[PDB]
Amino acid sequence: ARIAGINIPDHKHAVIALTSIYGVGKTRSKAILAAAGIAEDVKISELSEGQIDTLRDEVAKFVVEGDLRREISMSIKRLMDLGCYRGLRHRRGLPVRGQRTKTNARTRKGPRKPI
Amino acid sequence: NQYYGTGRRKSSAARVFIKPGNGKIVINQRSLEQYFGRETARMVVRQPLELVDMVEKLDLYITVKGGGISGQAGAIRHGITRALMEYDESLRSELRKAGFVTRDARQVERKKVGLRKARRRPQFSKR
Amino acid sequence: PRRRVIGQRKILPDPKFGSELLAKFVNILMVDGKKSTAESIVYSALETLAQRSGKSELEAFEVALENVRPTVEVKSRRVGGSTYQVPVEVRPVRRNALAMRWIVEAARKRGDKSMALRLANELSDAAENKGTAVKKREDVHRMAEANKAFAH
Amino acid sequence: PRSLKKGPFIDLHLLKKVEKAVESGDKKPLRTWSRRSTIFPNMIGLTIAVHNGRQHVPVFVTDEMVGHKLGEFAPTRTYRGHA
Amino acid sequence: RIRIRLKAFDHRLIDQATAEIVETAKRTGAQVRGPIPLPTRKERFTVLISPHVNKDARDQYEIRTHLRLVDIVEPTEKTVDALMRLDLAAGVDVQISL
Amino acid sequence: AKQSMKAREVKRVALADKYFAKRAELKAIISDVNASDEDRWNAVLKLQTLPRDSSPSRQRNRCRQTGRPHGFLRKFGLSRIKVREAAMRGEIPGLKKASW
RNA sequence: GGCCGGGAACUCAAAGGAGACUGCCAGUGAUAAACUGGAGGAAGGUGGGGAUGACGUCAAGUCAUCAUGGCCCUUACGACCAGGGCUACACACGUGCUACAAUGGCGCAUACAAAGAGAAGCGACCUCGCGAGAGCAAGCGGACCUCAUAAAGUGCGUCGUAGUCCGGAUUGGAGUCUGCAACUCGACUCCAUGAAGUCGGAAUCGCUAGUAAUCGUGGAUCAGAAUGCCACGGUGAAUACGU
Numbered sequence: 018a019r020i021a022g023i024n025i026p027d028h029k030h031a032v033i034a035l036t037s038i039y040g041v042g043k044t045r046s047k048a049i050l051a052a053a054g055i056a057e058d059v060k061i062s063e064l065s066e067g068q069i070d071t072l073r074d075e076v077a078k079f080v081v082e083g084d085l086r087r088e089i090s091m092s093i094k095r096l097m098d099l100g101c102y103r104g105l106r107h108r109r110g111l112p113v114r115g116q117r118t119k120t121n122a123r124t125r126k127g128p129r130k131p132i
Numbered sequence: 133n134q135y136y137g138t139g140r141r142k143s144s145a146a147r148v149f150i151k152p153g154n155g156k157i158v159i160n161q162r163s164l165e166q167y168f169g170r171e172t173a174r175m176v177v178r179q180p181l182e183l184v185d186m187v188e189k190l191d192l193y194i195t196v197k198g199g200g201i202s203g204q205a206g207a208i209r210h211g212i213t214r215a216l217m218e219y220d221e222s223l224r225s226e227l228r229k230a231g232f233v234t235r236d237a238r239q240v241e242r243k244k245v246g247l248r249k250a251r252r253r254p255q256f257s258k259r
Numbered sequence: 260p261r262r263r264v265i266g267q268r269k270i271l272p273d274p275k276f277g278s279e280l281l282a283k284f285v286n287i288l289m290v291d292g293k294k295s296t297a298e299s300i301v302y303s304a305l306e307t308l309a310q311r312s313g314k315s316e317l318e319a320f321e322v323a324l325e326n327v328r329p330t331v332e333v334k335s336r337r338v339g340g341s342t343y344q345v346p347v348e349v350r351p352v353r354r355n356a357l358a359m360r361w362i363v364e365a366a367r368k369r370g371d372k373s374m375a376l377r378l379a380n381e382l383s384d385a386a387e388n389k390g391t392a393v394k395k396r397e398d399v400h401r402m403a404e405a406n407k408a409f410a411h
Numbered sequence: 412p413r414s415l416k417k418g419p420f421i422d423l424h425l426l427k428k429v430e431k432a433v434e435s436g437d438k439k440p441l442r443t444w445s446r447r448s449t450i451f452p453n454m455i456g457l458t459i460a461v462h463n464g465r466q467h468v469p470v471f472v473t474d475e476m477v478g479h480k481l482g483e484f485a486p487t488r489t490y491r492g493h494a
Numbered sequence: 495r496i497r498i499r500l501k502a503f504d505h506r507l508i509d510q511a512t513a514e515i516v517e518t519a520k521r522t523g524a525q526v527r528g529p530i531p532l533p534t535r536k537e538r539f540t541v542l543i544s545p546h547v548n549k550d551a552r553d554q555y556e557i558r559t560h561l562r563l564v565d566i567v568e569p570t571e572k573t574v575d576a577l578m579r580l581d582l583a584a585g586v587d588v589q590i591s592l
Numbered sequence: 593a594k595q596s597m598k599a600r601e602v603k604r605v606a607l608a609d610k611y612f613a614k615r616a617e618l619k620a621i622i623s624d625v626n627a628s629d630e631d632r633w634n635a636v637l638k639l640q641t642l643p644r645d646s647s648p649s650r651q652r653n654r655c656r657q658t659g660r661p662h663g664f665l666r667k668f669g670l671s672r673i674k675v676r677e678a679a680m681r682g683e684i685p686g687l688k689k690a691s692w
Numbered sequence: 693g694g695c696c697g698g699g700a701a702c703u704c705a706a707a708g709g710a711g712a713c714u715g716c717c718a719g720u721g722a723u724a725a726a727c728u729g730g731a732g733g734a735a736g737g738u739g740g741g742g743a744u745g746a747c748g749u750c751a752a753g754u755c756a757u758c759a760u761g762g763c764c765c766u767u768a769c770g771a772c773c774a775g776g777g778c779u780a781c782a783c784a785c786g787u788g789c790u791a792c793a794a795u796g797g798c799g800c801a802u803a804c805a806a807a808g809a810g811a812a813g814c815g816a817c818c819u820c821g822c823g824a825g826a827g828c829a830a831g832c833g834g835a836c837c838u839c840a841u842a843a844a845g846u847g848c849g850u851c852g853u854a855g856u857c858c859g860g861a862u863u864g865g866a867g868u869c870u871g872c873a874a875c876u877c878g879a880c881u882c883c884a885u886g887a888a889g890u891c892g893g894a895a896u897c898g899c900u901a902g903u904a905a906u907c908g909u910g911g912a913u914c915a916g917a918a919u920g921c922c923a924c925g926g927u928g929a930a931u932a933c934g935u
């Protein structure tokens with residue numbers, strides 16, 4: 018119950034449980050779970066240490082959790098300091114992908130501000 | 133010899149051949165239970181033959197086209213009624229009273245200009 | 260309406276019981292036109308009630324329905340321009356419709372895992388005078404009794 | 412965006428201007444209108460003034476901006492705030 | 495075998511042409527099968543009748559295209575010669591295919 | 593509309609039909625899967641040189657009688673107002689008001 | 693394998709006819725007009741839906757579809773080209789789509805429609821790629837071929853009330869297609885992330901039967917770009933004492 022530096026739930030199936038890793042989704046969960054031949058209908062509570070080690074070996078094949086987040090920051094930071102249009106849209110807390118701004122855009126702006 | 137009947141309901145048309153027999157029913161090369169999953173359709177199909185009590189003495193070969201499950205079942209009922217009344221006219225008074233000889237003329241109304249549906253109007257604001 | 264033209268529309272008894280009452284109850288429980296999903300729940304609830312009570316399969320439903328039917332309701336009438344609360348009689352069809360609707364709405368507000376189980380509980384309670392439909396009927400009865408002086 | 416097989420897009424006149432400028436030695440910023448052209452590693456270290464609707468904005472090409480369009484470093488809308 | 499298709503916008507001016515072509519192909523000394531009534535095509539259009547705004551005011555028009563088919567089995571060498579100068583009605587399209 | 597708009601439309605049509613074969617040939621080379629990289633680059637640079645109005649996507653459908661750029665119908669070549677006015681005088685063959 | 697020879701019976705196709713007219717019976721009614729019930733019949737009293745809008749009112753809308761009196765400009769209020777803007781954003785309002793779940797989500801298997809478009813076009817089979825798509829390439833100016841497998845539905849299993857195996861907004865990376873040209877400012881695919889949202893205050897809307905509600909399909913516009921508009925089918929309700 019210690020994979021990729023985080024704790025994982027024990028009472029759910031493997032496919033549901035492994036997606037809790039930052040960077041591992043449902044497709045990635047299935048790929049990892051099938052790469053070592055473990056069924057999707059087994060709780061990790063009842064499972065042995067050797068195949069846990071194999072699961073760790075297979076999940077160690079991607080940039081996940083903190084090692085991912087790092088470059089994401091630079092992926093944003095290089096955009097901000099370069100001075101491009103996306104950097105300016107990032108600075109002001111406004112949409113970057115050319116959506117509406119006359120209305121909506123609450124998620125990028127937050128709750129309404131009474132004057 | 134063979135007796136023939138036809139039935140129409142919604143966009144569904146069915147044709148039925150009835151012969152003296154023992155109680156065999158065929159619908160598009162499939163059994164009665166292999167075609168209609170819902171028991172309501174089976175009951176509405178078997179209504180008239182059960183009412184006249186000629187269930188185990190006749191054989192039925194049926195073909196259908198168009199519409200859906202309920203429309204096809206209603207077409208089957210209409211066709212069975214027409215074929216049976218063709219076989220014997222003495223039941224003319226009975227099948228009519230059971231509400232089967234009358235052809236169900238209800239249809240689907242079109243879409244009109246300015247409305248989202250046949251009669252549904254858009255939302256209205258006074259001011 | 261202004262014309263008195265409308266009439267009664269024919270209904271088909273349900274297949275495996277031949278009862279119009281079950282047909283009407285299924286229609287009341289139906290949503291979105293998905294009938295096939297309605298009689299499934301109705302049948303599951305009916306069989307669960309039949310096995311739980313052990314009295315019958317259809318008589319338990321009839322007894323629960325009878326326990327809830329009211330006989331008086333309240334409407335508004337006027338004589339000199341002032342509105343009132345006047346008690347009036349209920350026709351049998353209206354009694355059955357009100358009872359079924361109250362039972363359905365009471366069932367829809369619970370915390371179980373299936374709708375058929377909620378239906379089983381509500382019909383059981385109605386047959387043994389514990390459901391909220393009993394409270395509805397009693398409150399209607401007592402509001403009708405309170406406004407008794409205005410009965411012409 | 413654009414297909415991978417087609418390759419990057421650039422205007423002929425701009426390409427000739429920048430190649431001549433690089434060959435002849437570093438010069439003054441090049442005045443241009445084509446905001447839709449892509450930036451090249453050849454264009455590194457030169458200054459290009461690009462149109463934005465009413466003016467020409469100088470931009471100095473750095474190494475990190477290779478791969479984008481010339482129109483992403485010159486805005487066209489002016490906004491300070493509300494009230 | 496020669497099959498002929500006939501198209502028209504009206505169901506009366508095409509019936510006369512069909513009758514005349516079948517009766518004239520009968521006389522040359524061949525056998526004719528038909529005519530075959532084929533499904534018509536309905537094309538519907540809708541337009542706005544106001545020169546400015548007034549969205550919910552429209553006219554709906556339609557165009558009906560009729561269709562007939564005839565066949566000739568084992569024709570005469572003179573049947574085609576006779577049919578090359580039939581001079582059908584103006585407003586009917588005729589298509590011949592061997 | 594104006595006269596200048598129709599003049600621009602006709603000039604665009606003429607230029608578009610003048611350069612059909614050359615543009616088709618250049619687009620065929622560009623879309624080709626197996627070709628030299630320098631050949632593709634030169635073909636792109638050559639296609640970029642041809643006038644913009646030669647592109648058949650620069651044209652806008654306009655009414656034949658008035659020139660209106662909105663409410664166009666391809667089957668008739670006229671806007672809705674012109675189609676209605678012509679059709680109600682029995683000048684479009686076979687067209688009549690529908691009902692069902 | 694209607695697959696073949698065959699057949700014109702059936703469905704259907706498209707032309708012409710029949711039928712429904714208070715026609716018949718009984719009662720009331722001023723013998724009438726008319727109303728009520730009944731026989732028969734597929735349909736009974738305007739069978740269902742559509743087109744059809746009197747004389748006029750609002751000095752209602754449109755001089756930017758078009759036409760037109762008067763006034764106004766004429767090396768400019770006329771004409772050409774490139775780039776930008778019509779897509780901005782502390783805010784308020786109208787009309788919609790997706791949800792807040794168990795009558796449900798997810799996986800596998802299995803049935804039943806109507807209507808319409810296609811020549812600079814619809815583009816099948818086969819091969820390649822996880823996918824959007826790519827290569828090669830028959831048929832079709834069409835009751836022939838393509839678009840193009842309907843979905844809800846049914847059987848089995850899993851989920852067991854959790855902001856969840858509900859929700860898919862936002863954001864990063866990698867791509868496909870159209871078009872000279874996807875930065876401002878296109879559409880779609882894969883991987884990664886996973887916001888508000890637990891049924892909505894004062895108020896307010898639509899609908900009388902194949903109607904409301906719910907699920908799918910097509911077209912015009914158009915190089916590319918629908919949650920809008922115009923059409924087509926599947927399932928299929930509750931209630932109307934009375935003014």
Ligand SMILES: [Mg+2]
Binds near residue numbers: 240
């Ligand atoms: Mg519908």
Ligand SMILES: [Mg+2]
């Ligand atoms: Mg009239």
Ligand SMILES: [Mg+2]
């Ligand atoms: Mg005015």
Ligand SMILES: [Mg+2]
């Ligand atoms: Mg005005």
Ligand SMILES: [Mg+2]
């Ligand atoms: Mg311009």
